[PDB]
Design a protein around this ligand. Sequence first.
Ligand SMILES: [Ca+2]
Ligand SMILES: [Ca+2]
Ligand SMILES: [Cl-]
Ligand SMILES: [Cl-]
Ligand SMILES: [Cl-]
Ligand code: NA
Ligand code: NA
Lengths: 224, 224
Amino acid sequence: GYINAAFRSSRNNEAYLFINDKYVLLDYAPGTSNDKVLYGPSFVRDGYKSLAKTIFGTYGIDCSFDTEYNEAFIFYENFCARIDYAPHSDKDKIISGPKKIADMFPFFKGTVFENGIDAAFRSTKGKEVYLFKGDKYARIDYLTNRLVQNIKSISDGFPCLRGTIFEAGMDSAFASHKTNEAYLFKGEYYARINFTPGSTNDIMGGVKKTLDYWPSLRGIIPLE
Amino acid sequence: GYINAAFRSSRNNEAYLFINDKYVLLDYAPGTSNDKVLYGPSFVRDGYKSLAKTIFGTYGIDCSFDTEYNEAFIFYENFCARIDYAPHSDKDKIISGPKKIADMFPFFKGTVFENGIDAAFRSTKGKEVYLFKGDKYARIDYLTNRLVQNIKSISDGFPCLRGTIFEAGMDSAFASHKTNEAYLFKGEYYARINFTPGSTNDIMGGVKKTLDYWPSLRGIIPLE
Ligand SMILES: [Ca+2]
Ligand SMILES: [Ca+2]
Ligand SMILES: [Cl-]
Ligand SMILES: [Cl-]
Ligand SMILES: [Cl-]
Ligand code: NA
Ligand code: NA
């Protein structure tokens, strides 16, 4: 019962975190010690009416990423959908789907990504997204629907992760509102990384405990 | 692109037929030659607003069976839902699901039925339903959620099918409004069978052409 998916909100310093078939809306306070749970924990089916009678409403969300405006891709196993998550309102809706991953992203056919994605986060560069499955990552443009480069080992693109628990996989991720930062999650741990698109960079550099960084999540995770 | 699923309506002499991602409502006229298409062929997503943004709306329905009143179980691969099909209105709605088959029917766990069902029809007896997968069939009570007997070969329970194309499997079925009769489909073929719950039969009619029996379907089956 840890964080299985996440996406950055269009609202400043807010992110949606999905755990089992539930979620929380968090003010994650990147520059301040005043993190706070703004909504939830709530069942996906209760919080998102448009998702109530779907596989997402039944089983929850296991990967997602912000795109632009108020729209996000959400996943469950081999299925995905594009949604308007309509922050702080009643107005959520499915724009596209649900569709099999292979039908939404045909370049994934014949790869390990066609059966499910572990984690994803929105790049600062153009319409780019990083997606993770096992020890591999992919880099796509969601607007033109194109694989930007060959699928590579996580360690090829993020050398800073060699020798950490993230080397063989990530459970969940979201991009920060602070430029070129992102959070990676696995079990009780997170890392805050700094990245530069297209450059084999580094930093960092600190695998810590999620509950130390967000005390407002005490008693919410782990969810037994 | 032949019939992939069907269910008997609560309305006398009407059946819903599912083909690719579409359906047809048919007056199947079991006692006369006045068969007609009443509605469709239309997309499932257009005709059932409640299914529009679900896996059933994207990909169609590959198995189903009438329960009672205006409720039907519908399937797509390993998922299923309980729906009110609200005949001749737009008051359709999902009552339960979508859920995985193992979660809805726990007794199917470990069986060949776990990952999808080929075809099904409602019995005249109590709340019993016959379900088909490959050369095997199952008989369940949907109320008590119970397997009524061991999973068996189609030939054992339906000896009239021996030596015919239906021996190895069926694509679709529905129970007739005429008691103890049902229609089974595969490719361009159908059989009309008499069945006696809990007891084998003898001879009935033989494998025939669906288009000969329902000329109102010419130009519709197969869907090119
Ligand atoms: Ca995940
Ligand atoms: Ca079928
Ligand atoms: Cl994620
Ligand atoms: Cl069927
Ligand atoms: Cl769905
Ligand atoms: Na994410
Ligand atoms: Na059926």
